[PDB]
From a paper:
Protein members of the Rho family are major regulators of cytoskeleton organization and cell morphology. The Rho family GTPases are crucial drivers of tumor growth and metastasis. However, it is difficult to develop GTPases inhibitors due to a lack of well‐characterized binding pockets for compounds. Here, starting with molecular dynamics simulations of the [name], we discovered a relatively targetable cysteine residue Cys107, as well as a potential compound binding pocket, which is close to a functional phosphorylation site.
Compared to wild‐type or mutant [name] apo forms, the alpha helix with residues 67‐74 was disordered in the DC‐Rhoin‐mutant [name] complex crystal structure.
Residue numbers in the entry: 4 to 180
Amino acid sequence: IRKKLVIVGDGAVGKTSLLIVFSKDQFPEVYVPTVFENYVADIEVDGKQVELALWDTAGQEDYDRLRPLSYPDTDVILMVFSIDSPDSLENIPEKWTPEVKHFCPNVPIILVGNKKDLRNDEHTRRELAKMKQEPVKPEEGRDMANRIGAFGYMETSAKTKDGVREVFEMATRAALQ
Ligand SMILES: Nc1nc2c(ncn2[C@@H]2O[C@H](COP(=O)(O)OP(=O)(O)O)[C@@H](O)[C@H]2O)c(=O)[nH]1
């Protein structure tokens, strides 16, 4: 009935924004604070009411020895990259997956490609082109989810809210089973 969820990924990919959208979607409405550490949110998925305890690693991306103190007893990981940052996707296999598999051995991972609203954004394409890069394609996220053994792959926009509810439903199912 209580499941611990930890959200990880590079700085500025939208970890906190995703927690905010989910927490503002709760009913009855509650004031959503600025930080998420053992933050209790109730969700109903399929039959069951579940308490999700949310932990955000934003602000700790460069504190390699302090960040893993939040990992014990985790039930599901949300591992996030940004579709507007191929660098953040490359850190999925190179940084986040080895870390999560060491500290959370058999814990399900949901791979989340956030900022999907920027895939066709003209400003984003122009800025990425300066570095000889382009937005992440959906096939690339799906392939990465298979490579790292993720339970599932989902694309979201915290800005438009599309896909956010579905990410948390999938994470709850994975935590339950
Ligand atoms: N266009 C767009 N911007 C986003 C999205 N999610 C977050 N952002 C923005 O990206 C920036 C970083 O978001 P934040 O939640 O603080 O990332 P965190 O460091 O991973 O916790 C903020 O300026 C947000 O407005 C999204 O889905 N689309």
